[PDB]
Amino acid sequence: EIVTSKYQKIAVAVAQRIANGDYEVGEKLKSRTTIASTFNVSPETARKGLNILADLQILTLKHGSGAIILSKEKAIEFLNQYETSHSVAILKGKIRDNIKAQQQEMEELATLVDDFLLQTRAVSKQYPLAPYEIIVSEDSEHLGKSIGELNVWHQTGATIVAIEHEGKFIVSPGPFSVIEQGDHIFFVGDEDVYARMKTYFNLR
Amino acid sequence: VTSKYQKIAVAVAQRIANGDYEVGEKLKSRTTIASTFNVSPETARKGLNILADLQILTLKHGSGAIILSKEKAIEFLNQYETSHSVAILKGKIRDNIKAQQQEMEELATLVDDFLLQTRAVSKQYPLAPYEIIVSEDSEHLGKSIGELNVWHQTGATIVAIEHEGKFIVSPGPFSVIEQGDHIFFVGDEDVYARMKTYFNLRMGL
Amino acid sequence: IVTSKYQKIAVAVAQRIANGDYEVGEKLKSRTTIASTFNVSPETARKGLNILADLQILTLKHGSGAIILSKEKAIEFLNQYETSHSVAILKGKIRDNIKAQQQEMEELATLVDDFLLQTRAVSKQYPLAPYEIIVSEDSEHLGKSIGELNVWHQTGATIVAIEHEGKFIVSPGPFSVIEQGDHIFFVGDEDVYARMKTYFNLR
Amino acid sequence: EIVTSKYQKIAVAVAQRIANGDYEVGEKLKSRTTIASTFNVSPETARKGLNILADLQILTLKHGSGAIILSKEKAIEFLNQYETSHSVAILKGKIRDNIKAQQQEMEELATLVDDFLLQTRAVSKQYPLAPYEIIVSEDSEHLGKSIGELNVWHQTGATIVAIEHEGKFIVSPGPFSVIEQGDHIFFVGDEDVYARMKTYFNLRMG
DNA sequence: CGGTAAAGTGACGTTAAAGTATCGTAAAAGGGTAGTCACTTTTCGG
DNA sequence: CCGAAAAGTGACTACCCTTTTACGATACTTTAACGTCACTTTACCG
Ligand SMILES: Nc1ncnc2c1ncn2[C@@H]1O[C@@H]2COP(=O)(O)O[C@H]3[C@@H](O)[C@H](n4cnc5c(N)ncnc54)O[C@@H]3COP(=O)(O)O[C@H]2[C@H]1O
Ligand SMILES: Nc1ncnc2c1ncn2[C@@H]1O[C@@H]2COP(=O)(O)O[C@H]3[C@@H](O)[C@H](n4cnc5c(N)ncnc54)O[C@@H]3COP(=O)(O)O[C@H]2[C@H]1O
């Protein structure tokens, strides 16, 4: 997710304090070791954060001395740009997460289409008396009705051989079997009957 | 297609060009660069090798980095930016997004035919139908499936009739069963027993 | 959680057994011959034959080959394989994947929109570097607007900003007034700079 | 872009000949080196192509007797089966080209947006001013006109500092400089002036 | 009171460690190769 | 004319080579800490 440098984190924190006014312009800061203990960091790590601010003309520290705040206006500008552009950073990170996730989806797609082709080949390899099958997952006035109430053969030309409901099968279902949403209908007919069944159950 | 070494180069060229490093001021070479940019000394060294190759600085003094000319640093910045991507980078990203949008449209249509080329989905379950040859005399011959009311008589769902070697799939109630036809139907073993009895086939094993 | 060629071998051989092409008594060819017929490794063929062995469709205690065991259990295995593998279920997954990818790209499009909006355009760090003069000398051109002076036609300069009493107006237009002591920021070349200096009596 | 084993090619070729009738049913496909010489291929790749044929039950094999042709109807059916499924597989191979190019453009997008962030922080470190740069790449009633004819400052609030045309820059352009399609316009102003310039030159660009 | 020297503290620079990424090597599998094995056909001899 | 032997070819198999994928190791980069150096302040002495 979001990771920044600890050095940067310290720099941003102290720059925010300066911009808020805790450290006024011209405020002395003979520091290193004291603020290092405030931040529970090695005294040396403190400078790693405060000379980056000096080259950026936010403060001035002579050798062996304390940091003197220089420009309120420029420290404010820098802190603002950094935080709003670290929001630029968070948006950037979300784009990289999104594109990597999409590469993950497209890799799954690759294996799916290879697997799809493999199954189409293996399924064709038999041919005893293959029937036609659909999943009635869309809303339709034909759901919650029995096969006889629908009068299926007269509506679509299909002969239903089996209904799968909640993973269970009824073969040779008869007129009293009910077709419910999500059920699988196995049926025989030709390509036109398959097309009729798809339209009849609002499947495309 | 770029690494942060270029960014270092631009940053230090910017300092030189603004006048932050006065004309002829010396840097502490790798140590100063690493302390400033947080970049490693090995990348930094190539970063400054860039400005050496363009004569913005000289490194023949192991001590550090001597800056040479502010005018050449400004030249560097300009050509660098123009040959790289800034407002072009915004345009390139837009072009990339639109190219991928078109590629996805092509993909959507490809898959449509791929899926529609499957004009049906089969199962090859054990639901494959029993086959009986109605070769014996029977009161049921010469009648239509609907007149017989077959499912209610035997529990069978007829999927096809073979008559004179020709098949009718999904036969409906008006198809007639004639002597010698083959009836294909789904059911279980008990449905098979009912069909065999119904059509006077008790002789068959 | 379903990817295998050995399963394709398993179903193929089970379909042969169940249809009756391979009678019960009959022996299958060598594990190496089946691997070559199905164009795969002997090891994957070993997995396929182990599948039907675990389902008691074949036994391999003989080196000559695999002996067929049960035609009905091959049929029993075809039913279970149908369930596990699934047919249009596979197609449906591809449609869902495509739909999810389209939504992910819509999210990406909007993300980039804000990223690019930012708030403004950009910069090319050009030597456009605008000149600055301070109009501190007396001049008949002071107390006049940029349009009244017709500056570009007089000096070749394009004024980008005026500083007046320490405050800035950027893109000033023809109605902005140049007063004594103001700073004029402008673009042009060295000759334009020279014209501006002379024009405002800065020699 | 085609990856069918050599064996499989050999099988298809000889099966096609059988289905055409060049190799009749009782006629024996004898001479294995002689079959290798027919296609100038190795005799063992040919022998195995024929073996895969024999195992799909198109021809029968036996010592001393060249492969005898068994069934016309089934060899014909199998030829047609390979004809459909192989093009199905080629269509599958196509979606692969799409996913590959798109993954490449995503890896490309990732680098582009990383550098875009790099540019934003780099330009945030500016000097007195950074003029907005627009590329007038869209069709517009304003193209082919001079800055003075357009009366740009009064239309948009922008002061144009330079035009880039055919890679050449004119600084301090004046009213007689013309804006042509594809030019880069550099101008000063604020965020609102930028919005006016973008609208004025038909750059909504969604 | 002024100057000098010493000590202490803060900063800067350099080096080391840890984590992540990339590349190379190795292993496994899938597909082609020649050697061997057997069977059938042809020729010769009885 | 029939039988036997030899030769040629089909059938068989163990193997080898090539390609792809996965894992491991090395390298690089970033962040932290130890050490050393400089500057400032104080105290003491002249
Ligand atoms: N292929 C077949 N196999 C076995 N028997 C068949 C049959 N076709 C028709 N019948 C029999 O004839 C009756 C009328 O069939 P019909 O198709 O007109 O009218 C049918 C049909 O439109 C529909 N239906 C019933 N089962 C169906 C199924 N499995 N598939 C499609 N439609 C079915 O409900 C109506 C009443 O069905 P019900 O079973 O009470 O009554 C059925 C049934 O006893
Ligand atoms: N670089 C530019 N960017 C944007 N628009 C430009 C432009 N150059 C010319 N125009 C537009 O064309 C009009 C006539 O410009 P011209 O240079 O002849 O006549 C100008 C010019 O001599 C002078 N002027 C105005 N603004 C100026 C400026 N920022 N710098 C220098 N001269 C300016 O006053 C006259 C009237 O100015 P006004 O703005 O009413 O009208 C301007 C303006 O609308």
d(CA A16, CA A55): 17
Residues A31, A34: Cα–Cα separation, whole Å? 6
* R_g of chain D computed on alpha carbons: 35
Residue C27 DSSP one-character state: B
Residue closest to C102 by CA, chosen among B108, B24, D176, D41: B108
SS3 annotation, chain B: CCCHHHHHHHHHHHHHHHCCCCCCCEECHHHHHHHHHCCCHHHHHHHHHHHHHCCCEECCCCCCEEECCHHHHHHHHHHHHHHCCCHHHHHHHHHHHHHHHHHHHHHHHHHHHHHHCCCCCCCCCCCCCEEEECCCCCCCCCEEHHHHCHHHHHCCEEEEEEECCEEEECCCCCCEECCCCEEEEECCHHHHHHHHHHCCCCCCC
Tell which residue, B78, C193, B74, B89, has the closest CA to residue D167.
Answer: B78
* Tokens matching residue A29: 């800061």
Concatenating the DSSP letter of every residue in C128-191 gives T--EEEE--S--TTTTEEHHHHTHHHHHS-EEEEEEETTEEEES--TTPEE-TT-EEEEE--HH
Of ligand 1's listed atoms, the one at least distance from the Cα of B185 is 3
Chain A hits for B171, CB-CB cut-off 8 Å, are: 159
D42 CB neighbours strand F below 7 A = no
Cα C173 to Cα B42, D150, D171, distances in angstroms:
51, 15, 18
Q: Do B123 and A189 touch (CB under 8 A)?
A: no
Neighbour count for residue C36 (Cβ, 10 Å) = 17
Q: Do C42 and C3 meet the contact criterion of CB atoms below 8 Å apart?
A: no
CA of D190 from ligand 2 middle (Å) equals 18
Of D75, D71, D67, nearest to D31 by C-alpha is D67
Q: What residues contact A48, with CB distance under 8 A and at least 6 apart? A: A7, A10
Experimental method: cryo-EM
As a whole number of angstroms, the distance between CA D154 and CA D101 comes to 47
Distance in angstroms (rounded) separating the CA atoms of residues A136 and C48: 35
* Beta partners for residue A160, in sequence order: A187
Chain A interface mutation, best of B39, B90, B123, highest count of A Cβ atoms under 10 Å? B123
CA distances, C175 to each of C87, C149, C169, C171 (Å): 76, 10, 12, 11
CB within 7 A of strand F (chain D, 65-104): 65-67
From the list B87, B100, B117, the residue facing D105 with the nearest CB is B100
**Residue B184 exposure: Cα atoms within 13 Å on the Cβ side:** 21
Q: Yes or no: say if D93 and A93 are a contact pair by the CB < 8 Å rule.
A: no
Give the number of C-alpha atoms closer than 13 A to the C-alpha of residue B35, restricted to the C-beta side: 17
CB B58 within 8 A of CB B68: yes
Segment B28-31 long-range contacts (CB within 8 Å, at least 24 positions apart): B28/B64, B28/B65, B29/B59, B29/B62, B29/B63, B29/B64, B29/B65
Structure tokens at A14: 């102290």
Query: Do A159 and A153 touch, CB atoms closer than 8 A?
Result: yes
**Is residue A29's beta carbon less than 7 angstroms from any atom in nucleic acid strand E?**
yes
Resolution (A): 7.1
D205 touches chain B (CB under 8 A): yes
Q: Which of residues 19-58 of C touch B (CB under 8 A)?
A: none
Residue D179: both structure tokens together: 């804006």
**Backbone phi, then psi, for D157, in 5-degree steps?**
80, 5
Instruction: Tell whether C98 is within 8 A of chain B (Cβ).
Output: yes
Angle between the B87-116 and D72-124 helix axes, to the nearest 10 degrees?
A: 160
- The one-letter code for the residue type at A14 is V
Q: How many A from CA of B158 to the centre of ligand 1? A: 9
Backbone phi, then psi, for A113, in 5-degree steps?
-70, -40
**Residue D38: half-sphere exposure toward Cβ, Cα within 13 Å:** 15
CB-strand contact D159/F, under 7 Å: no
- Strands of D159-165's sheet in order across: D132-135, D184-188, D159-165, D168-171
Kind and range of the H or E run holding A179 = strand A178-179
Q: Which of C20, A201, D57, C55 is nearest to B128 (CA)?
A: C20
Residue nearest to atom 36 of ligand 2 (CA): C147
> Which residues neighbour D150 within 8 Å (Cβ) at sequence distance 6 or greater?
D142, D179
Exposure string (b/e) for C2-33, b if CB count within 10 Å is 16 or more? eeebbbbbbbbbbbbbbeeebeeeeebeebee
Closest CA to A163 of A187, A132, A185: A185
DSSP code of residue A66: P
Q: Which two tokens stand for residue B184?
A: 């294909």
Which residues make Cβ contacts (< 8 Å) with residue C34, sequence separation at least 6? Answer: C9, C13, C28, C45, C48, C49
Tokens of A144: 């919650």
**Which amino acid type is present at position B153?**
Q
Q: Tokens 């599948």 — which residue?
A: C51
- Please report, as a single letter, which amino acid is at residue D83: E
Tokens 């996805």 locate to: B104
**CA C150 / C1′ E36 distance in Å:** 104
Query: Which nucleotide's C1' sits nearest to the alpha carbon of D51?
Result: F11
Backbone angles phi, psi at B75, to 5 degrees: -55, -50
Work out if A148's Cβ lies within 7 angstroms of strand E: no
| Helices H / strands E in chain C, number of each | 8, 8
HEC profile for chain D? Answer: CCCCCHHHHHHHHHHHHHHHCCCCCCCEECCHHHHHHHCCCCHHHHHHHHHHHHHCCCEEEECCEEEEECCHHHHHHHHHHHHHHHHHHHHHHHHHHHHHHHHHHHHHHHHHHHHHHHHHHHHHCCCCCCCEEEECCCCCCCCCEEHHHHCHHHHHCCEEEEEEECCEEEECCCCCCEECCCCEEEEECCHHHHHHHHHHCCCCCC
What atom of ligand 2 comes closest to residue C150's alpha carbon? 22
With contact defined as beta carbons under 8 Å apart, do A114 and D93 qualify?
no
Nearest CA in chain D to A92: D113
D200 is written with which tokens? Answer: 């004025």
Chain A neighbors of C3, CB-CB under 8 A: 111, 115
Q: SS3 for A59? A: strand
Question: Is the alpha carbon torsion for D107, D109, D111, D114 positive or negative?
Answer: negative
Contacts of A127 (CB under 8 A, 6+ apart): none
Which residues in 1-40 of chain C line strand F, with CB less than 7 A from it? 30, 32-33
Is D60:D68 a contact under the CB 8 Å cutoff?
yes
d(CA C94, CA C102): 12
